[PDB]
Structure 1
Amino acid sequence: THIWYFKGVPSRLGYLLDLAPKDLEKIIYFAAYVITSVDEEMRHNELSTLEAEMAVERKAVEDQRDGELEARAQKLEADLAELEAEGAKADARRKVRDGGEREMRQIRDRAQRELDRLEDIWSTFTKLAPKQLIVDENLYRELVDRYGEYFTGAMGAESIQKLIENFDIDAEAESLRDVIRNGKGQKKLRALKRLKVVAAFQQSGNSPMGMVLDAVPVIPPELRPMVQLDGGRFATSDLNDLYRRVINRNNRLKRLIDLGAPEIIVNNEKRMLQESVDALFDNGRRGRPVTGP
């Protein structure tokens, strides 16, 4: 992505894609996934079947937790009866009873952990739509595992590219015009700004896809003159240094993807590449500027 946009004030991407800067930067630097497209009508046809499948699975976790609770409660009751038979002091009775009660509380709370996770999964499944965000990777991992069928969501610049190219401008422009036709100044000003940006896009005759680059150019060599000192040292404009960094990192990416490796390293490496390109198009725009000497 082009540093001049996801960091600019106003951030053209934020207005066009109606995303907060926090979410956009998390998406760009590979922090939190995004949901691209969802065949909502296809999910709707079996929404009842999905809910039934939910009922049976949640009843299954209910049955396992109930069995565990029954087993542990019977064990504690048997232990208390044994202690009474031995005629031990009430201190031992309360120690064992508190231990067992805390064990059962922990068991029930873990059951509740599973149940609340399941309802979170559902909630996020049913009320699911584009432009939504999932901060935690584990929950998304879970979603794609249990239901990896309907919604396809990836992380990185290509995610934004697919979202925008799949996105349409005229419909949003009409909706914003309709909102403006109404009142409610508070939201009306935001609608006005977004409509201005979208109308500029539409009138330009271009497409937003220009905000995601695949081929940066390089200026001629003379513009970045190369200088030889008494010892022939390289002390010319660092433009050569920045291009060195970008090219080197791209070649590392290519070699690594050729060799094969898990997602973590590849994603980290892509983040590093994005950082370098942002630095080259501008140093010090955001974050610590690079400093060699």
Structure 2
Amino acid sequence: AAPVTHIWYFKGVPSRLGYLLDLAPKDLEKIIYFAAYVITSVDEEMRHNELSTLEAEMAVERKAVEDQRDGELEARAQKLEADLAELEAEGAKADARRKVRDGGEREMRQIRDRAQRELDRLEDIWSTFTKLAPKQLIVDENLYRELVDRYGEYFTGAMGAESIQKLIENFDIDAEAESLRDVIRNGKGQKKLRAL
């Protein structure tokens, strides 16, 4: 019902599937055993001529997060101003008042590094969407699910033996053949030995 790789051309030394696709065997084992997705195809031209609008929407979402966290910091500043005004108006301990002020400061620092983590997540998914190349592994699958629903129409990514079948399907042999000919022509050291 679903395709299946041969065990003979995958789990030998050298792995012939890994040599034909130039992929490491400990990543091929993660692909064909449903442990990590792979990029079966990519569309460089649509990302190429729409990347300005896409990074504009990225900047829109990132600035919305910036405005939301500025409102969060202003809300914590208003709450700490109310804490100071209700702390220094009655008879209270200045050590406990400093602890209240430091609690408000830890609240707004939690706000700011949570916002920093959200911005780092958005810039990380943007960095990966820029560096989206075929034969790339996307481990832990949540970044992949966050990267499918945004821009599903610009790339495809599968997992397993059907992905390996599609990778072999959209594969020219003469291109990598002449490329390896050029590399063994103009190489030296370990690189030429692996290309041989």
TM-score by length of 2: 0.93
SS at match of 1:86: coil
Distance in 2 (alpha carbons) for counterparts of 1:93 and 1:152: 57
Distance in 2 (alpha carbons) for counterparts of 1:7 and 1:100: 58
Do the aligned partners of residues 87 and 146 (structure 1) sit closer, same or farther apart at CA in structure 2, a change above 3 Å counting? farther
Distance in 2 (alpha carbons) for counterparts of 1:146 and 1:64: 21
- Residue equivalent to 1:221: none
- The offset of 1:152, in angstroms, is 0.5
Distance in 2 (alpha carbons) for counterparts of 1:86 and 1:175: 80
Distance in 1 (alpha carbons) for counterparts of 2:73 and 2:31: 43
Distance in 1 (alpha carbons) for counterparts of 2:10 and 2:73: 52
RMSD of aligned residue pairs (Cα, Å): 1.1
- The offset of 1:22, in angstroms, is 1.4
- 1:115-134 correspondence runs (5 A): 115-134=119-138
- 1:1-293 correspondence runs (5 A): 1-190=5-194
Greater CA drift, 168-177 or 100-109: 100-109
- The offset of 1:16, in angstroms, is 0.9
Distance in 1 (alpha carbons) for counterparts of 2:69 and 2:23: 41
Give CA deviations for 1:40-60 in whole Å, capped at 9, x if unaligned.
111101111111111111111
Give CA deviations for 1:61-120 in whole Å, capped at 9, x if unaligned.
111111111111221122012101113111211221221111111111111111111011
Give CA deviations for 1:167-199 in whole Å, capped at 9, x if unaligned.
111001111111111123121111xxxxxxxxx
- Residue equivalent to 1:230: none
- The offset of 1:124, in angstroms, is 0.7
Distance in 2 (alpha carbons) for counterparts of 1:13 and 1:25: 11
- The offset of 1:31, in angstroms, is 0.3
Aligned length: 190
Q: Percent identity?
A: 100
Greater CA drift, 37-46 or 89-98: 89-98
Distance in 1 (alpha carbons) for counterparts of 2:56 and 2:62: 10
SS at match of 1:153: strand
- The offset of 1:145, in angstroms, is 1.5
Distance in 2 (alpha carbons) for counterparts of 1:182 and 1:81: 75
Greater CA drift, 181-190 or 124-133: 181-190
- The offset of 1:147, in angstroms, is 2.0
Distance in 2 (alpha carbons) for counterparts of 1:22 and 1:116: 29
SS at match of 1:183: coil
Structure 1 residue ranges (4+ consecutive) displaced by more than 4 angstroms after TM superposition: none
In our comparison, the structure showing a higher alpha carbon Rg is: 1
Give CA deviations for 1:187-215 in whole Å, capped at 9, x if unaligned.
1111xxxxxxxxxxxxxxxxxxxxxxxxx
Distance in 1 (alpha carbons) for counterparts of 2:181 and 2:22: 16
> Which one scores higher on RCO, CA 8 angstroms, separation ≥ 6?
2
TM-score by length of 1: 0.63
Greater CA drift, 60-69 or 95-104: 95-104
More strand by share: 2
Extract unaligned runs of 5+ from structure 1. Answer: 191-293
- The offset of 1:138, in angstroms, is 0.6
